[PDB]
Design a protein around this nucleic acid. Structure first.
Lengths: 146, 82, 109, 231, 199, 49
RNA sequence: ACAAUCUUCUCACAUGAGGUGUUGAACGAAAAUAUUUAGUUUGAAAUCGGUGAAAUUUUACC
C-alpha cells in the first residue's frame, strides 16, 4: 500500500483529461497566445524493459500473476543485472488501475518531482530490506514440491 | 575520481578538444544540481557525453569509470565504446 | 515463563510511550516500558525498550515490525538476549517523564 | 558615556587588537551581562543592528527566501542587478516541499553564506528550516522587500549586508558579534558603541542601568571587561 | 484491530490541536466579533478521538456532546471566544428567519421532564413554558429569532437537533467519509443553504 | 532440481545496454500533441468542436 | 481517515512596538554567569543511563 500510495500521485492522465487539457490550448491558440516535463509512471512491457536497460528506471514493480509467465520470468534477473531495485507486487489488476487500464504486466518509476524524491528513496530502501534483503536465498530454491 | 570537477569548480570560484568544449559549456551555464542540469539540457548533454568519450579514449582498466562519469556530471557511466 | 525484552529503533515522531503500549498490548500484555528521552528537555531519542512476558512473544514482534516502513522510517526491532540486559532499562518506566523548565526557574530564582 | 557616564573604549579596543596580533579572521564578540533576563523565552528572529563597519564579508553569497511566486522576486533580482550578491531566491512554498529531509536541508544550508528572508515569511521560517539551520549558527534576517521595487530590494540588501545579526534567547548574558580582527580598532569601537546604543534602546529593558558588565574578546580570547557599572 | 499508524495520527493531531490552543489564547486574545446578528448558529462537524481535555469540557458547555448536534447561541464577547477556541471542530454562521423556522417546525425537539420528547403538542410547550410567556411553537421561533428575555430559558428547554449528513445519490452512498464537504470555521449565510439542503 | 545458479547476473552492469544517443524528442515539447492541438484549433475555427 | 490549521504579516505612527515556533547523537570554544554560548561530522542516523484539573491516582509540551 505504501508503494501504491506514491504511485497514485504519478498516474498518467486519462484520455478524458488528455483532451480537456488539449482543448484549452486549442482555444488559446484559436484566440491568441512553454511548460514543464510531464511527470507520471512508466508502464508497458517493451517500454519498461527498455528503460531498465537504459538505466532510466528507479524502481520496477512486477505483476505477480502474468498469464504466460514467459513475459516477466526474465525480469528479476535483468533488473538485478542493471541494479534496478525491483519488487513483485501482488496482482496485475492493482497495477492496472494505477494507469487506467484493465491490467499492467509491469510498472516502473523513472523520475519523480523533488517534493516526492525523499518518499521514493524511503520506499526503495524498504523494498531492499523487505523484498531483496529477505528471501534472496529462497529465490534460488526450486519452489513447490509441497 | 568522482570529485575532480568539484575541486576545479571550487578553486576557480575562489580565485575568480571536446573535453575543453564541455568544460566551457557547463561553466557558461553555471553535485545533484550539476547532474540535474545536464540530464535536462539536450545540447549540454551531447557535449557531456562526447567529453567522456574523448577523455576515456585519450587515457584503461585502472580508472574507475563510474566515478569518471560522475566527474563529468552524469548519473551513470554512458555506453561509450572504449 | 522467561521475561522477554524487546528493543525498537528509528521511532517516528509520535510513537511515544502511550502509543506503543496501546499497540503492543493487543499483541500481548506489556509490563515495563521505557522510551529513551533527552535529559534536558525530555525530547525523544527515537528508540525505546519494551518487555514481554515471554521471549516467544518477544520474538513474535521481532519478525513482523522489523523493517516496518513507518512515516518514512524503517522500524528496527529485534530481541535482545538476556545475557547482556542491564538492571534498569525500565528505571522510571510507565511514569510521565519529568521535564523541568530550567530557563524559567532560573529567571524566577 | 551612556553606560556609566564614561567611555573607556578605543584604548581597550586597540590593546585587544595588539594582544590578538601578539598571540599569533577571528570574530570580535562583545560579552554583556544584564541584571535581569533580556528575554522571557527564546526569540528566533534576527536583530537588525546596523553598524558602520559590517561583519558580513562583501564576498558572501546571499539567498533571499521570498513569498510565492518566486518568479516575481527572481525578475526583481534580475532587474536590480543584485545577482552578484543575491545568489538564489526560493519561494516559501518551494522551500517547504523541495527541501524536506535532514540531509537535503543541510546541503541547502551549506550551499550559501547568508540566508536573508522576506518580512512576511520570517514567521513560518522557524519551521521548514529545523534545528539544522536555526541552531547551527545560521539564522535568517528580516530583509524588508515588501515594497516590491528594485530600489527597495537594493536598499534592503545593502542595509542587511551592513548590519549585524543577533538572536536573543531567554538568559541573563549574551554575546554579540562586533567585527573581525582585521577590522580597524576605530571601526570596531564605533561598531561596539553602535551596538551598545541598540542594546540599551531595544534590547536591555532598563537600558544602560540594566547592563551589569561589558567585556570584549575574540572566539578563543579572554573577555577583557571594557567597563563596569559603578552602582 | 488498530494499526500503528492511527496511534501516530492521533498524536500528530493532539500536538497540532494543543499548539493551536496556545497560540489562540496567549498573545491572541482578540476576536473579530461577527456583527449585525444577535443570534448565531453552530453545528459540530467532527471530533478527534482521545479529545483534548479543554475542548472536551467546552463542547459539553455548549451542549454539543455528540456530533451533528445543532445549537443556537446568542452572539456576545464570551460565546464567540469559546467558539474561537473550538473553531476547527464547528461550522458556524447566521441563520435566516426561514431557516430557523423549518428547524423548529421539522426538527425541533423538547426536553419535557428530561426525556427525548418531540415538540408534537403546543399544550406541552405551554405547560413547561407558560410562566415565561411561551405558549406555542410560533412563540418559540419569535422569541429565538428576537432573542428576548426568555431566550436563555427557551434554549435550555430546546433539545439539540441532529443534522446527520444526507445520502441520496449513488455517488454519496459509496464515497468514503462523505460529509457533504463540510469545512470548519465561518461560513456566513452558507449555513442557511446547508440547512436548506439538510432541512 | 539444483539450486539456482547466476553465472551472469552476480555482477551489476554499470553502462546502459544501448549506445545510441538520446534523440531530441525527449527534450522538446511533444510534436504529437501539436498535431492534436492544431487539429483542435482548426475545428474550433471551422466550428466543429 | 501514514488525511487534518506552524501563520505568503499585524499595531501605533517615514518610524516604533510586535510575530513563539527548533529530530537525535558524537568531537570539541572558554567566557559572561543552571541559561546562552566557536567551529564541526551525520540516512529525521540511535541498543541502560515548580505548577495543577479531574476520579488515594490520571496526566507522555502544564
Amino acid at each position: 500500500t505504501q508503494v501504491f500510495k506514491l504511485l497514485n500521485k504519478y498516474r498518467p492522465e486519462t484520455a478524458a483529461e488528455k483532451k480537456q487539457r488539449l482543448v484549452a490550448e486549442a482555444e488559446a491558440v484559436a484566440n491568441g497566445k512553454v511548460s514543464k516535463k510531464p511527470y507520471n509512471v512508466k508502464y508497458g512491457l517493451n517500454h519498461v524493459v527498455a528503460l531498465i536497460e537504459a538505466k532510466k528506471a528507479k524502481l520496477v514493480l512486477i505483476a505477480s500473476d502474468v498469464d504466460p509467465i514467459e513475459l516477466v520470468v526474465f525480469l528479476p534477473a535483468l533488473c538485478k543485472k542493471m541494479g534496478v531495485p525491483y519488487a513483485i507486487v501482488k496482482n496485475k489488476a492493482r497495477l492496472g488501475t494505477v494507469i487506467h487500464q484493465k491490467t499492467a504486466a509491469v510498472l516502473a518509476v523513472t523520475e519523480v518531482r523533488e517534493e516526492d524524491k525523499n518518499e521514493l528513496a524511503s520506499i526503495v530502501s524498504a523494498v531492499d530490506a523487505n523484498f531483496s534483503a529477505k528471501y534472496d536465498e529462497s529465490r534460488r530454491k526450486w519452489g513447490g514440491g509441497i | 575520481s568522482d570529485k575532480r570537477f568539484l575541486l576545479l569548480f571550487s578553486f576557480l570560484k575562489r580565485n575568480l578538444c571536446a573535453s575543453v568544449k564541455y568544460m566551457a559549456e557547463l561553466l557558461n551555464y553555471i553535485q545533484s544540481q550539476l547532474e540535474k542540469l545536464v540530464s535536462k539540457n539536450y545540447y549540454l548533454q551531447q557535449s557531456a557525453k562526447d567529453g567522456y568519450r574523448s577523455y576515456l579514449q585519450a587515457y584503461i582498466n585502472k580508472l574507475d569509470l563510474a566515478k569518471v562519469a560522475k566527474s563529468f556530471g552524469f548519473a551513470h557511466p554512458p555506453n561509450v565504446n572504449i | 515463563k522467561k521475561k522477554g525484552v524487546l528493543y525498537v529503533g528509528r521511532l517516528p515522531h509520535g510513537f511515544y510511550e502511550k502509543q506503543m503500549r496501546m499497540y503492543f498490548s493487543q499483541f500481548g500484555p506489556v509490563l515495563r516500558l521505557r522510551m529513551s528521552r533527552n535529559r534536558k528537555t525530555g525530547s525523544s531519542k527515537h528508540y525505546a525498550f519494551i518487555e514481554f512476558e515471554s521471549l516467544d512473544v518477544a520474538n513474535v514482534v521481532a519478525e513482523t515490525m522489523h523493517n516496518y516502513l513507518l512515516y518514512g522510517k524503517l522500524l528496527q526491532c529485534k530481541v535482545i538476549p538476556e545475557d547482556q540486559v542491564h538492571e534498569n532499562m525500565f528505571k522510571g518506566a510507565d511514569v510521565p517523564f519529568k521535564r523541568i523548565p530550567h530557563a524559567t526557574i532560573a529567571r524566577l530564582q | 558615556e551612556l553606560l556609566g557616564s564614561d567611555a573607556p573604549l578605543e584604548k581597550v579596543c586597540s590593546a585587544l587588537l595588539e594582544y590578538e596580533s601578539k598571540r599569533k579572521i577571528e570574530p570580535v564578540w562583545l560579552q554583556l551581562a544584564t541584571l535581569k533576563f533580556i528575554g522571557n523565552n527564546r526569540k528566533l528572529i534576527p536583530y537588525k543592528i546596523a553598524i558602520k563597519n559590517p561583519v558580513i564579508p562583501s564576498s558572501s553569497e546571499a539567498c533571499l527566501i521570498v513569498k510565492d511566486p518566486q518568479r516575481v522576486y527572481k525578475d526583481l533580482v534580475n532587474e536590480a542587478g543584485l545577482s552578484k550578491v543575491v545568489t538564489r531566491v526560493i519561494g516559501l512554498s518551494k522551500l517547504k516541499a523541495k527541501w524536506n529531509s535532514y540531509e537535503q536541508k543541510r546541503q541547502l544550508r551549506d550551499q550559501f553564506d547568508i540566508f536573508l528572508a522576506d518580512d512576511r515569511v520570517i514567521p513560518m521560517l522557524p519551521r521548514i528550516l529545523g534545528k539544522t539551520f536555526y541552531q547551527k549558527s545560521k539564522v535568517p534576517v528580516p530583509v524588508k522587500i515588501s515594497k516590491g521595487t528594485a530600489e527597495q530590494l537594493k536598499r534592503e540588501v545593502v542595509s542587511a549586508y551592513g548590519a549585524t545579526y543577533f538572536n536573543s534567547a531567554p538568559c541573563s548574558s549574551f554575546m554579540i558579534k562586533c567585527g573581525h580582527v582585521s577590522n580597524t580598532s576605530t571601526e570596531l569601537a564605533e561598531n561596539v558603541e553602535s551596538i551598545l546604543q541598540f542594546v540599551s534602546k531595544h534590547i536591555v529593558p532598563d537600558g544602560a542601568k540594566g547592563i551589569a558588565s561589558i567585556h570584549l574578546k575574540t572566539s578563543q580570547s579572554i573577555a577583557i571587561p571594557l567597563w563596569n557599572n559603578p552602582n | 484491530f488498530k494499526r500503528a499508524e492511527t496511534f501516530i495520527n492521533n498524536y500528530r493531531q493532539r500536538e497540532r490541536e494543543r499548539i493551536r490552543l496556545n497560540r489562540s489564547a496567549k498573545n491572541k486574545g482578540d476576536i473579530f466579533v461577527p456583527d449585525e446578528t444577535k443570534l448565531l448558529f453552530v453545528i459540530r462537524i467532527a471530533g478527534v478521538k482521545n479529545m483534548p481535555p479543554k475542548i472536551r469540557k467546552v463542547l459539553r458547555l455548549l451542549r454539543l456532546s455528540r456530533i451533528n448536534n445543532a445549537v443556537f447561541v446568542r452572539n456576545n464577547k464570551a460565546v464567540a471566544q469559546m467558539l474561537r477556541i473550538v473553531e476547527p471542530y464547528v461550522m458556524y454562521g447566521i441563520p435566516n428567519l426561514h431557516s430557523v423556522r423549518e428547524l423548529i417546525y421539522k426538527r425541533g425537539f423538547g426536553k419535557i421532564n428530561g426525556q427525548r420528547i418531540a415538540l408534537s403538542d403546543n399544550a406541552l410547550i405551554e405547560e413547561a413554558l407558560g410562566k415565561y410567556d411561551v405558549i406555542s411553537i410560533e412563540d418559540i421561533i419569535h422569541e429565538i429569532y428576537n432573542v428576548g428575555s426568555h431566550f436563555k430559558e427557551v434554549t435550555k428547554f430546546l433539545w439539540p437537533f441532529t443534522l446527520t449528513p444526507v445520502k441520496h445519490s449513488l455517488m454519496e452512498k459509496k464515497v468514503k467519509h462523505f460529509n457533504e464537504g463540510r469545512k470548519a470555521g465561518y461560513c456566513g449565510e452558507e449555513i442557511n443553504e446547508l440547512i436548506k439542503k439538510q432541512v | 532440481y539444483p539450486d539456482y545458479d547466476d553465472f551472469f547476473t552476480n555482477t551489476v552492469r554499470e553502462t546502459p545496454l544501448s549506445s545510441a544517443p538520446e534523440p531530441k524528442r525527449r527534450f522538446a515539447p511533444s510534436k504529437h500533441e501539436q498535431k492534436r492541438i492544431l487539429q483542435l484549433a482548426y475545428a474550433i475555427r471551422k466550428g466543429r468542436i
